[PDB]
Design a protein around this ligand. Structure first.
Ligand SMILES: CCCCCCCC/C=C/CCCCCCCC(=O)OC[C@H](CO)OC(=O)CCCCCCC/C=C/CCCCCCCC
Ligand SMILES: CCCCCCCC/C=C/CCCCCCCC(=O)OC[C@H](CO)OC(=O)CCCCCCC/C=C/CCCCCCCC
Ligand SMILES: [Ca+2]
Lengths: 344, 142
């Protein structure tokens, strides 16, 4: 408000400093994360009502209206997402799309903002359907609090609890995408992390280790696909004849072999319920060979990365990254935080 | 004060001091995934096989014990047919495990390089001499 009223003043001059603009953007993102956390402040200790029970503020309300309506925190977070997307679009328009895509931070921000937009679009579609159902109830139902009246099946579905929801209804998609976007949001803390002396080189080395890990992960993915296909072919014919129905389908085989990396897949994944001990013993051998192979690949990755790191260069890289961060703020255009940049 | 265990204690102290810096970043990642999974699974309290991500405390427990592999995979599955949310939770839990492995491996490599760069002997003897000088005063007689 002060910047809008007096763009050229002591406060205006202070707020246009590159460090002050960086602090403004960091504070805006902290407020965005606070809104993300506060939107779910009614569930910190868990939801009181069971998923099979519907609660409505007034007796003539469709439950989906109550469970899909936006709150003021939802409005604020939608405005924040719109502002950040507008800032990203302005950057892409001004500087060029090809250069914009070839940057980790820009593409990640675009991805998380797109996921937020998709989640809010799905929630808005659910809200529209619920509002149409509520309008139908208010215009054609006057039967004492939705007890004696039986709604048409096109609209009776909106009186159902969470358990009766279709697996592909808009609100489930909305909340899944919202969870993904919330996970991706806090990853932008590492965008402002390099500006700090202690946490800059750490982030630089973390990015370098991720880049080194990716190439080994490609080979491990090839080995993983090999064992997934082999064990799925071995155990596909035993669906109702296995202990934990693992390796019976491509999804199940993929889950079992992926969670085996962290030791979270039990050995009974290879045991059958029949007397075909040959198949069970081949599965045991293949699973053991897979575990030994993944340990060998992890050991080779660790050793190769240790050698590569053993080959004062991190300080230079961190200072270069921090200087890029600074030069991103020296231009006077990026003055206000993205949520407040909408107002012209 | 011991010759054989003093250097070990000094090295352990330096290891803890190096570990804290990476622990800050891992705490940021941990909070990210804790909030995400809690938001995903807060609406399924009695609709899950266990109470893994139903609350913030529960999400913190599940993700912290996931570091040591002491949290079961079934923490993600649901008792409903909402396979979209279950698969999103599976992907997020797998990404959390991969991310924590990456962070731990990066911490290990960075600390190995830092240690690679008769240095601990001087530190140990300085600490031992500080311990000695703490007792040269006549006040601490008993
Ligand atoms: C891309 C990187 C490649 C890395 C190569 C890793 C492979 C090397 C590891 C070999 C360990 C064998 C790891 C295999 C361990 C088997 C685990 C098991 O529980 O099996 C029980 C079964 C039935 O009771 O025992 C047998 O019925 C057979 C005797 C065990 C010897 C089987 C030979 C396995 C492969 C040999 C080659
Ligand atoms: C701060 C340090 C950052 C480190 C970055 C770590 C992230 C990189 C790891 C990626 C491994 C994916 C780890 C994700 C593994 C998923 C584990 C799982 O059990 O899911 C089963 C689900 C449903 O049956 O499968 C799918 O429905 C999807 C197909 C799997 C591919 C999903 C893409 C995951 C993320 C891609 C990016
Ligand atoms: Ca950007």
């Amino acid at each position: 408000i002060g910047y809008w009223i007096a763009p050229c003043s002591r406060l205006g001059k202070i707020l246009r400093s590159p460090f002050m603009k960086f602090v403004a953007h960091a504070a805006s993102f902290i407020i965005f994360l606070g809104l993300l956390v506060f939107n779910a402040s009614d569930r910190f200790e868990g939801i009181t009502t069971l998923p099979n029970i519907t609660v409505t503020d007034y007796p003539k309300q469709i439950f989906r209206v109550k469970t899909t309506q936006f709150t003021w925190t939802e409005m604020l977070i939608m405005v924040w997402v719109l502002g950040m997307m507008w800032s990203e679009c302005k950057e892409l328009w001004l500087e060029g799309p090809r250069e914009y895509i070839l940057q980790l931070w820009n593409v990640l921000d675009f991805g998380m903002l797109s996921i937020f937009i998709a989640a809010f679009t799905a929630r808005f579609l659910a809200f529209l359907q619920a509002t149409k159902a509520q309008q139908y109830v208010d215009s054609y139902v006057q039967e004492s609090d939705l007890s004696e009246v039986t709604l048409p099946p096109e609209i009776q579905y909106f009186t159902y609890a969470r358990d009766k929801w279709l697996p592909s209804d808009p609100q489930i998609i909305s909340e899944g995408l919202y969870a993904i976007a919330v996970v991706l949001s806090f990853s932008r803390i590492a965008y402002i992390l390099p500006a700090n002396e202690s946490f800059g080189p750490l982030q630089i080395s973390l990015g370098r280790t991720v880049k080194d890990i990716f190439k080994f992960m490609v080979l491990f993915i090839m080995v993983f696909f090999a064992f997934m296909i082999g064990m799925f072919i071995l155990y596909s014919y035993y669906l109702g004849a296995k202990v934990n129905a693992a390796f019976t389908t491509v999804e199940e085989s993929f889950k079992t072999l992926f969670w085996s990396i962290f030791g979270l897949s039990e050995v009974t994944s290879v045991v059958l319920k029949y007397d075909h001990k040959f198949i069970e013993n081949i599965g045991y051998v293949l699973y053991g060979i897979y575990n030994v192979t993944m340990v060998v690949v992890l050991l080779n990755m660790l050793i190769a990365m240790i050698n590569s790191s053993y080959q004062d260069d991190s300080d230079v890289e961190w200072k270069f990254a921090r200087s890029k961060l600074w030069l991103s703020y020296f231009d006077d255009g990026k003055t206000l935080p993205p949520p407040f940049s909408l107002v012209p």
